[model samples]
Target chain A: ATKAVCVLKGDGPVQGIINFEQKESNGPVKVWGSIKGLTEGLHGFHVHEFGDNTAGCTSAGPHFNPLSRKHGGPKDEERHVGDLRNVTADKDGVADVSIEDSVISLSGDHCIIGRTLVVHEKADDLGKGGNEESTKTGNAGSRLACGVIGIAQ
Target chain B: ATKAVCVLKGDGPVQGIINFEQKESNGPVKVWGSIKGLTEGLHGFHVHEFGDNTAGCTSAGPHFNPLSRKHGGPKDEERHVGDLRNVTADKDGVADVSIEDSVISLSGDHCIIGRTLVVHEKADDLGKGGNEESTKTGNAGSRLACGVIGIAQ
Candidate 1:
């Protein structure tokens, strides 16, 4: 299996370690991690287009829609490959994330490394809102925290 | 063998892809890349403590000296593991870099992935100047560009 790690950091207390695993080149990628210090609710999560992060979380760019798909839920055929739905934070303001999806990849064309994992400020609408912003960002709000994906030991 | 890639980007035209290779976990790591848009001269190059380029190149943090060593050239026994001397830009304002050093590792405690690579605005003195600034950073000037190191195919 191949593995990767992204240690999220921001100007605030919001941070965590997200681990990614793939058993095969074209298999589903598994994501499991604990994100601390977010409001209690579902927050939008996705693999962004660039790892630049040069201007903090703002420079991570938009969702990695490499195939030019619109924003939607992880299981939608019309969704962006970077979509992973939402992660719910508990009363303690921590989100325990464990998700597996085939939309994103770990090797070859859609590899997520060199990109970024971003946690947004609001719940993802999954493009069901029938609005312009929903198709672009699932109506997700501003970026809260982010981390660059890298090779694991 | 293991491989990684870092795509440098900043506010200016300074950008490039730096490829890292290691045949064994503890073997010498080789770096090769082409950086465009710099004056013809030497630029301090090193692996930084963080992959966070938040706030452009300023947030990459200081040089990665995990062993608590002083700043020095790539070949110095007491130099920081992140030190790789300098990459010189040619008359065309492009730096063709090729350097191999055993001090930097791609795995274990000194693993560089998830860290950062930075290009400085001035030449690194390599700590030989016997000054305070030299010992701390080899008097390497301001950061011009940087990128996060990530897993590669």
Candidate 2:
């Protein structure tokens, strides 16, 4: 009830565990994990609409927008509920992510359980880029790895 | 939306993709997959109440039963919705599972999109062993592998 884990895996050697924890019902959610095997730069990390991976990551659908808002950064007021801060990779392609957000909750209507967590191949433009796909997906290239969010015991 | 996939991964190497499909809302749901590395014999496979694997297989909870019925075999009309047929594994520890059921649906009120699929360590008693756990869990033993059901593209 207080924790959730997303075991990220790809077609190759799987390595990623994005953890989600909440202190209270409406309290800020803490997202942290150690994701390896990436480029030494910013990588797009976002929650998806569905946990389905039948056709791979593409089947996860768009950003989890229960509010029907546009895509933006994790701090933006007009951002989607699933829009989260990007995780920056180090020299060894390891991104030790850490973030706290008030918009994302793990209880009631806006809960993120039974959803998907996706790690993209490139950095997110944060809906600031004047591109066609920027407002929709933040131009976060392909999905490198993803896992379904499940409640931890 | 007619096709869904559940990726069964355990602590070890024995795992594969389990695909679910249906042609009609009230039709039989086709369950088939190339599940490998299972011990030789019949394996108890069922759908749990929760897809949350926060505590691994234990967090999946009891068998899915919207009707609150007693546990029985796949052929028993008084069975729980998740009391499925035993998947037979070969001597090489590979079980290419296949089944068709009308109760475990993929649409309407009975749809099981966010549930958990569990493969047990031992054969299901089919509620006929006359034991304490027989009518409840069929004494399927420990969970070998489990995964959340997700939608396909």
Candidate 3:
């Protein structure tokens, strides 16, 4: 199985490996893996648009939105093309991330190979509801830490 | 039930609400709500110490902090006394916010009163949690959206 490895390099020093399986269904992308070597605490993780090596992860651009539409939640009528799934960190900066998004394709035109992976310093709000605005995802603030997702050996 | 009235008004309007809910168990405060608006979007929403009055809710001040500490995550043990939390907005200014923190007090000496709520065009990179100079709170970024939480009648 092809694996995607996320190596967090910086003062925070967090890293992890992921193995994803894309199914042929309406469900989302199924991801299962262990991201180890992170600090013992919480860290925000997400898939971003673009994969410019020059940006050094900071310039991964916005969330992957191949559709070039408005941003929505993981399950919304219109969302970021890169809006995949989220995973939580443990006491040891470890986390279990799993998701099944229909818009994710490792290959083809929509592949996430050249995208960026972001780790927030804070937690995502998951788009609070009721206000005529809050919808699906949390409005997580801050870009504390970040890294890029690339092909694993 | 006591409800916290939230309103979104800024340059980036939402096509529809995303997520909104009160959070209580997280910290010291009793009422905290999360509202999600868009994905791949970024907007500003914060829980000011005071309610919004005339002048479009300018009474609320910056992130409430009695201890006068550095900017940090809500869960940080050594953060600003008022560095309660961060507001998130998707790419299109779709924001999902969770407002509830002990830090956001309304009563007592440390109550959050007469504060101002403002938004930013940029994102707050909450302390990256690395390097020797990583502050507890987030690095001051650009202000996009702003709204003061008002006491609902």
Candidate 4:
């Protein structure tokens, strides 16, 4: 199996490590992360267009949507490939979850390696909200933390 | 104390951690690091201009020469503030050293927070080579690894 890792950091106390794993050729990527120091609620999460975090999370660019699809949940057929559902934190301000997705791959055209992953301040509406931003970005709030996906050791 | 840190990673087996600590206001910053997985020799080290490591070490930009001073060793009367002395590794590929410097601070124009630090593949000539590139970059070879200097936890 091949894997990629990201060490997320931001201006706030939010910090964590996310791992993307590919078990087979052209198979779904398994995304697992354990984030600490966040508000106790759901936060919008997605892979951004660039891996550059020089200017903090905003410099990472927009969502990684090469297919030009709308923003929705991970299971939506018309959703962006970067969508992977929401992560909720507990009272202790930690979110540890593992999810799998077919829209993202470790290689090939859908490969997300070298891209940027971001955590937003608000929860994603999952495209059910009646607003243009919902279809465009699920109305995710300000970026809280960001990281780049790189080859894992 | 205000401090900063960097997590260096490279294409090869080179990876390590560097930290900067400011104990007193307007005083010399205490720099300490324990870097492993390096060749058993001296490696040129300096704080680059950018914290962006999206393109590995290449994107970090040039040395942090804010005063427009010429490149020289750390002990030189005139040198780039980023020019710390070379770090040497032992046979076990580990370089653990602690030093102090007045040029780099945790605040003000000399602030190193949010900057980038780079480790070179070869020793830095420290502008003694009497060449153009030497005066600029000490003719340091390929960048082995890079990391962002961020607020310490």
Evaluate model 1: give its lDDT: 0.82
User: Per-residue alpha-carbon lDDT of model 3 for A1-153, expressed as tens digits?
Assistant: 333434333334554545555444333456666665554554445677643323244555666666776545567666666665456778867777766667766555555543455666555444443443333334554544444344332
Docking class of 4: incorrect
In candidate 4, position B140 carries an lDDT of: 72
TM-scores for chain B, in order? 0.97, 0.96, 0.56, 0.93
DockQ of each: 0.15, 0.30, 0.01, 0.04
lDDT of 2 at B126: 96
* Chain A agreement with the truth for model 1, given as TM-score: 0.96
Sort every candidate by TM-score, greatest first: 2, 1, 4, 3
- Misplaced by over 4 Å in model 4 are B1-145, B148-153
Please, what is the whole-model Cα lDDT of each candidate in the order they appear? Answer: 0.82, 0.82, 0.46, 0.79
- Candidate 1 deviant stretches above 4 angstroms: A1-83, A86-115, A118-147, A150-153
User: Compared with the true structure, what per-residue lDDT tens digits does model 4 show for residues A1-153?
Assistant: 877766677899998878788999789888887988889999998988765555678767778888998889998998998887788899999999798999998666776665677888989999998888899999889889887666553
Candidate 2 global TM-score: 0.74
Candidate 4 local Cα displacement, residue A43, angstroms: 0.6
Candidate 4 lDDT, tens digit per residue, B1-153?
Answer: 776666678798888877778987778898887878878888888987655555667766788878999888856458887887578888998888688888888777776665667888788887887788888888879888877665543
